[PDB]
Amino acid sequence: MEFAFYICGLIAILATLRVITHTNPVHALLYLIISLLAISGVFFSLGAYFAGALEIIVYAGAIMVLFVFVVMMLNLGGSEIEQERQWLKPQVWIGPAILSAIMLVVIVYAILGVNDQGIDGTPISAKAVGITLFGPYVLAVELASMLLLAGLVVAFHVGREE
Amino acid sequence: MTITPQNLIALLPLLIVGLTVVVVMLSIAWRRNHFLNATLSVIGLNAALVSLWFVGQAGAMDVTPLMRVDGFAMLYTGLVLLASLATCTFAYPWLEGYNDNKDEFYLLVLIAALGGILLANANHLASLFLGIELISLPLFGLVGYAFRQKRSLEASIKYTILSAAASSFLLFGMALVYAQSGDLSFVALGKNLGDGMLNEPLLLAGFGLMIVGLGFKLSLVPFHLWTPDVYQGAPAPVSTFLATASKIAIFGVVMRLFLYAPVGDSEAIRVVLAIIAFASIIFGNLMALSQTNIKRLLGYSSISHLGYLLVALIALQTGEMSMEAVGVYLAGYLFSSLGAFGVVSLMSSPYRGPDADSLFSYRGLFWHRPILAAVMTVMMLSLAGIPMTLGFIGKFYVLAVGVQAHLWWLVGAVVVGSAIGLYYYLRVAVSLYLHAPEQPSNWQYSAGGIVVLISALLVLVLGVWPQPLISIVRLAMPLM
Amino acid sequence: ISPELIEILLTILKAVVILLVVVTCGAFMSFGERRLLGLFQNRYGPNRVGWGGSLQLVADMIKMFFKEDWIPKFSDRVIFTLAPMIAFTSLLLAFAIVPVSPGWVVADLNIGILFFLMMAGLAVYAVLFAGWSSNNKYSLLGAMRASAQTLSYEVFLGLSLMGVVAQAGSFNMTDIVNSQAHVWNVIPQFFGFITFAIAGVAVCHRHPFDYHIEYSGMKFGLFFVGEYIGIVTISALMVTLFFGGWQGPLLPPFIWFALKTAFFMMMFILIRASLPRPRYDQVMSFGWKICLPLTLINLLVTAAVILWQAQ
Amino acid sequence: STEVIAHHWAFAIFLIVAIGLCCLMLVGGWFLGGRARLSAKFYLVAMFFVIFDVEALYLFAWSTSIRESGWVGFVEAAIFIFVLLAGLVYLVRIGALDWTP
Amino acid sequence: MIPLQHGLILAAILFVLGLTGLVIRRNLLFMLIGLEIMINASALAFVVAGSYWGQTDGQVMYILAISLAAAEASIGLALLLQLHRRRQNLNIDSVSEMRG
Amino acid sequence: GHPNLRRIMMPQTWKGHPLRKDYPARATEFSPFELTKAKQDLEMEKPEEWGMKRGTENEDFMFLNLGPNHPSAHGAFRIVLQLDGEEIVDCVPDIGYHHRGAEKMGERQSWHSYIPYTDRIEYLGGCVNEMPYVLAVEKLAGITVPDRVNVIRVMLSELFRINSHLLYISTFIQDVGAMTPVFFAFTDRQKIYDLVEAITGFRMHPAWFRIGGVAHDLPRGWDRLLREFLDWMPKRLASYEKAALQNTILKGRSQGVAAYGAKEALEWGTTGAGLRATGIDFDVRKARPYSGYENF
């Protein structure tokens, strides 16, 4: 499970790096779906079986289905931006690259100084997550239903046709 | 833990607002009626405000591993409910001119009020994250409720992307905090440290990213650049709600987080918050010096006033009257912002389509709307911390709290920013009383005018006699 | 040579045998769909290539292999090649959890039917990619409509299966087939059974719920073999979830499982031959207004009966 | 253990043989043989699928631990499903889920 | 025997890559893509934190994180569709009218 | 004053008017250059010349071509559909993809050698298409055919009417989505074709009616096949009704779809089942009886 975790993490990192630099929207969505599958494999390596199952069920099965739906609705063939390639010229991307590298260095320095006994990877089943979800986390579930209802109402109101 | 009928009695405003959300949704599904759905929403909000009495009779106790209900939660629930009721009252005459569906506005207002109540009662990272999101997403819908208007669509896009970024920042911060600690409750964020090792690197980084997200949601410098654009582009009742209820609820849950956490008295977080408060006060006052639009001016005003609140927050562990200062300041700032954005909403209603400009043109307002001009200039005086006003009492509380804890840089910043605020607030007031070149009538417009007049009378009366407000804020004390 | 390595090799060979049989059964059930449509339509079907037409599938396989492999010039090559790959492998991995016999299972996962839901979402991705990459307006529009159909029925596929999951108290497939040791789940979860059958027909793009015009050669064959493998997978899943799977009074467990699965394959073919195709709007209205509340009420009543019977 | 690692190896070989079979089929197909704006309804239905899918995942987590949660959990999931059905009734009754107006 | 620091470092790398993609891309769809990457990285970090402590809390907040991600992607794609409807381009530099 | 007066049987790049007397009726020489030019016209085939308006002004007005090639037996023709999503807002049908010069051939064949060309006018009709031509030529010739001739012609017209109606019902049921009644109705059509083959010697285009009668007498044994078909048919018709025509999915696909009243049928010249579905009881076999239809 160690080798699976590192290979899935490397694949997720490489796919995300390909996503943020690609110019084709559908290719970028495909690489991010690959990254989501890799992060689900990371979840399965750590014993969070329900989290990986919902990563492919919802994150890599519903949300980016919606993204691919919107992309093919717009018929994005790379117009007025693919003719530019502005983010590939140094003068746009080096500055944010130093910004993100400095933030990553600071977060990594903070991460390396924590008590670490290691992750045993004992599988936490979905039954225990469901017990905690309807035990100590009842109001979280009810208000999350209300939150998704709010998002539904907002997206319906904005994304109509008329 | 578990859920008890007594815990259900302490759950009363949350359950009442959620039941109102479901009832209003089913009423919209039955037939789209603007007056009936607005009446149902204000009836539910008033029912929650009344059920605060039964919550107080029930006492103070921990309803969930997530929620903790006490006097402080009651006070901030009341403030958020009053802001939501004022938002509905101002929104009805504005929505009278909206050609699309007018009924989803009150549904989103009720859901955001539910998120505000959850933030008021939050005692957990889960409840804090969910309450922040439950405030933010209906505000995404309400800010861009007039999406055919170009400015409102711009404000909605900016608010949505920036608040999603801030929510992800906050989530990563909670992830680092939970990785360090292992407990998500507020009382255990740094409990497993000892012997002067409170400045744990991963815990400090997680609280820093949480500070990034919350300081976005509180318009604290340098996470403040969204505030004038989103305040201007949004509808004026939405500007009222976003200026009052969201800021009050998020600051209250920040107050509980920094009061209950054992890492809240860390000196590094204290110095970082001092830097943020200094920069927030000075920058928010300086950017409003040369503003001709009232919405951006009130956005920079909100930045400066949240800086004053943060100054009151920094002295939480050192001082003893810090929470009571925050409560008095929040009541005064709520009433002043309600009056100012209510005058803006009453003079910007009905919504005259997505094509006509929504410019305020506050100059010479007294010679055709005298009562609104008097209310508005009372608000402009109250935001300046001038006596006879409740805003002065809040400023006096912030100054006393800063003097007690010897936060002299913050006291000097408060005074300098107060002088700059004096300049631009007084410029707005005298422009209201100048002469203009050129120059509704239902009971709901009258209700909005009655609301802003009642806010003006409350500001004046509690500025000349603040003892009832001080007593009812000191009655609202959380568990120690 | 060690007994642990012998057991590992035996389990690997078992999984290989299962995989070869389901792929072969999908191809020969394309042929069997032709023959069964011939039977139901008062004719013979293909019965000249070999004995009884048994060598017909080899003839279409050779024709598919020795055809001009063609990719459109103004299309995306990677996505065009990728869509049949997904449409094959997604429902193959969905079959990878079905227990065909006690001891004959590929992976006894603790997620199980969640893994089936993941694979169904990836099948929706296959349809979307096939429609977009063809660079054709007709195929793009058809993929939009077909994907909206599959979304409108995957919105309640899992909620239909939650009655069986609630009764079994587990996500495991073997626990689900062991929970039906006395009564098959088609009796208590009848509404879950009909909603899952409707959703399984709809997400497999089968009649009467049916972007392939730009595909040719081995890619079209991969698409069709993946579709019939999905038929095999959905039939075996409903056998395991509602008809006990391998349990039966007299016959060996494989005999019962294969008879029930073949009966549901024949029911697929009969549904194709009998029912007319409804309109788009009525299909999506049936998916949203009817099946989703039915699954929710079924889950609520199932939970109430389960908690009432827990003394 | 032995049975668990054997099943893991069997699943890995299943994945490898399936991927290799599809790749070999496509390679054999390539090598052999001679040569010579949409409406907003799609977004609305996909968004509705996403929202009701995450509410479905909540019901998925509840359904596998019904007996351990008791009647209290049934009451809470009943409130959840009631809000679900109220949202569904709201969507249907305003013509959001009608493909044709 | 997987260190918590390695999982947190992977999550931080994904978070900063998502933030870089959110900043350097003017296309609104790529910014929404970056937002999805950052919130998924935050959810992964919480899953790592919950798996290190052996608690279901990490997966519960993962569930809340992806509920937020789903609803935010819904609202963001609705706003993107509206932007493409009324101005036919997804360049956000055109959407800069409020300033000063 | 015509709103859009363009060519309807020939392409717009056609020189001459073919039904004029000074036009050469025969085929001109095939040239591959004309084929390549018309292929270029197809590849580079402007929603203004066809009378269409609103050329994607709502940013959703999608254009598709429904023809000209069709997977159906009704023939080849093209409709350009403009849609708001799935809703049809404008349609320009382009016909003439099946023009055979039948009238120009009528000026080029004799009165007797034109009957095969009358057969292929409506190729599902056969003797029904023969009938008005031979009746009109008998009007020109002064021929009053005997009653047995009228009986024979009515028999063959009714047999071909049953054949065409079976094809139409099967095709409609296949269009809705049920795919078995087409096989069964074509078996019934094979029974009708067995009888027609025995009588005339040909299946679909018998060319059997003549000026003043029919080609031959009835063969010895036709009544046995007619009795077999009359016993075979009604049970199969009831089976078709119960299996597909009373299906509620078919009713939902069919009822209330593309409806019009008596006024719209009258103003558009709609005749047959479409006219009589509006309550207008106008059938030629009763209103203006021909060929001894009064005796049935």
Ligand SMILES: CCCCCCCCCCCCCCCCCC(=O)OC[C@H](COP(=O)(O)OCCN)OC(=O)CCCCCCCCCCCCCCCCC
């Ligand atoms: C070979 C070169 C590279 C080729 C291309 C990449 C292919 C994918 C490589 C990464 C994923 C598979 C890694 C190999 C896994 C083999 C099985 C294994 O190691 O299982 C260990 C463990 C089993 O669980 P446990 O019970 O903890 O085991 C302890 C034993 N007592 O397992 C676990 O706990 C979980 C195991 C991982 C989760 C399942 C597999 C996820 C696959 C995600 C693929 C994402 C997309 C990849 C795209 C690649 C191309 C861009």
Ligand SMILES: CCCCCCCCCCCCCCCCCC(=O)OC[C@H](COP(=O)(O)OCCN)OC(=O)CCCCCCCCCCCCCCCCC
């Ligand atoms: C075009 C090709 C693209 C790439 C395709 C994939 C390439 C790599 C394939 C081989 C990878 C190695 C094999 C997988 C690992 C098997 C072992 C495993 O998953 O073990 C972990 C867990 C075991 O659970 P269990 O044993 O029941 O629990 C008891 C305690 N251990 O079991 C689990 O957690 C099971 C759940 C995870 C199973 C993942 C299966 C693959 C998912 C990705 C499919 C991709 C389909 C193609 C692309 C779609 C569009 C992008």
Ligand SMILES: CCCCCCCCCCCCCCCCCC(=O)OC[C@H](COP(=O)(O)OCCN)OC(=O)CCCCCCCCCCCCCCCCC
């Ligand atoms: C108008 C507004 C809307 C109104 C509502 C509309 C929608 C209605 C939907 C109704 C859905 C009802 C679902 C009922 C399921 C209850 C049965 C059940 O789940 O029982 C559980 C129990 C097994 O559980 P247990 O004993 O724990 O054993 C598991 C082993 N570990 O099981 C058992 O012990 C066996 C119980 C067998 C019970 C069989 C009879 C009831 C279920 C079948 C109904 C068939 C209806 C047919 C059509 C009728 C006309 C429509």
Ligand SMILES: CCCCCCCCCCCCCCCCCC(=O)OC[C@H](COP(=O)(O)OCCN)OC(=O)CCCCCCCCCCCCCCCCC
């Ligand atoms: C292994 C997996 C495969 C298993 C194979 C066996 C199961 C196959 C399941 C197939 C399901 C097909 C479902 C089709 C639903 C179509 C719904 C629809 O669109 O109905 C609309 C129709 C008319 O609606 P209306 O409002 O009147 O329209 C007026 C418009 N002018 O409304 C109507 O006509 C009303 C009735 C609608 C349909 C009700 C449900 C019928 C389901 C199909 C029959 C199943 C019978 C049992 C089969 C064996 C089961 C094992």
Ligand SMILES: CCCCCCCCCCCCCCCCCCCC
């Ligand atoms: C047309 C408007 C375009 C706006 C582009 C904005 C790009 C901002 C890039 C910022 C780069 C910062 C690089 C690091 C600075 C030093 C470290 C942080 C401050 C201490």
Ligand SMILES: CCCCCCCCCCCCCCCCCCCC
């Ligand atoms: C805080 C104490 C009260 C502050 C002022 C509140 C508003 C009072 C308004 C009363 C009416 C003012 C009339 C001004 C008329 C000016 C005429 C100038 C003529 C040259």
Ligand SMILES: CCCCCCCCCCCCCCCCCCCC
């Ligand atoms: C649609 C059916 C798919 C089946 C896939 C699995 C095939 C596995 C073959 C195993 C055969 C032996 C099973 C165990 C012995 C019991 C049955 C003996 C007679 C076959």
